[PDB]
Design a binder for these strands. Structure first.
Ligand SMILES: [K+]
Ligand SMILES: [K+]
Ligand SMILES: [K+]
Ligand SMILES: [Mg+2]
Ligand SMILES: [Mg+2]
Length: 136
RNA sequence: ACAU
DNA sequence: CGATGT
C-alpha cells in the first residue's frame, strides 16, 4: 500500500478543541499550499476536518481534476460519505459561524455529484499528512 | 479499541 | 493532561 502522490491532502488546525479552527489543502507531492480557510473563532476538530474535505471536493470539481483527496480524519471521511456531519457542538451565537459553514457544506454535498476518491492517510505508516499544521 |  | 468522534 503506497501513497498516491497525485492527490490533494487536507487537514484542520486548531487553537483549542473546541476553539479557533482553520484548514488547508496542499499538493501531496510538493507541499504547495492550494487553499487556506480564514480562522473560524469557535469550532471542533471534526467540523474543521469535514469542511476541509468538502472544500477540497469543490476545489477539484471547479478545476476539472480527478485527483483523490487524503484526510487523516476517520470521522470526517465518514461524515462526507454519509453527507451528514454528526457534531455535538452546541449551537449558540459564538458557534453560529461554524454551524452555518457545516450546514452549507452538507447542502452542497446533497446538491452536487463527484467521483473523487476520499482516502485515509495512513499516519502510522507514512507519518504526518502533508497538510498538517505542525502544532502537536 | 480506533481515528483525530 | 484535556477535547471530538465511530
Ligand atoms: K498539528
Ligand atoms: K494525525
Ligand atoms: K476518546
Ligand atoms: Mg487531521
Ligand atoms: Mg494535523
Amino acid at each position: 500500500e503506497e501513497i498516491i502522490w497525485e492527490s490533494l491532502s487536507v487537514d484542520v488546525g486548531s487553537q483549542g478543541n473546541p476553539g479557533i479552527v482553520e484548514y488547508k489543502g496542499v499538493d501531496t507531492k510538493t507541499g504547495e499550499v492550494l487553499f487556506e480557510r480564514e480562522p473560524i473563532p469557535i469550532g471542533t476538530n471534526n467540523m474543521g476536518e469535514f469542511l476541509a474535505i468538502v472544500h477540497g471536493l469543490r476545489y477539484l470539481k471547479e478545476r476539472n481534476s480527478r485527483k483523490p483527496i487524503y484526510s487523516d480524519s476517520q470521522t470526517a471521511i465518514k461524515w462526507v460519505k454519509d453527507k451528514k456531519a454528526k457534531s455535538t457542538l452546541v449551537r449558540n451565537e459564538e458557534t453560529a459561524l461554524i454551524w452555518k459553514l457545516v450546514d452549507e457544506a452538507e447542502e452542497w454535498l446533497n446538491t452536487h455529484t463527484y467521483e473523487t476518491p476520499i482516502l485515509k492517510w495512513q499516519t502510522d505508516k507514512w507519518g504526518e499528512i502533508k497538510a498538517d499544521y505542525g502544532r502537536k
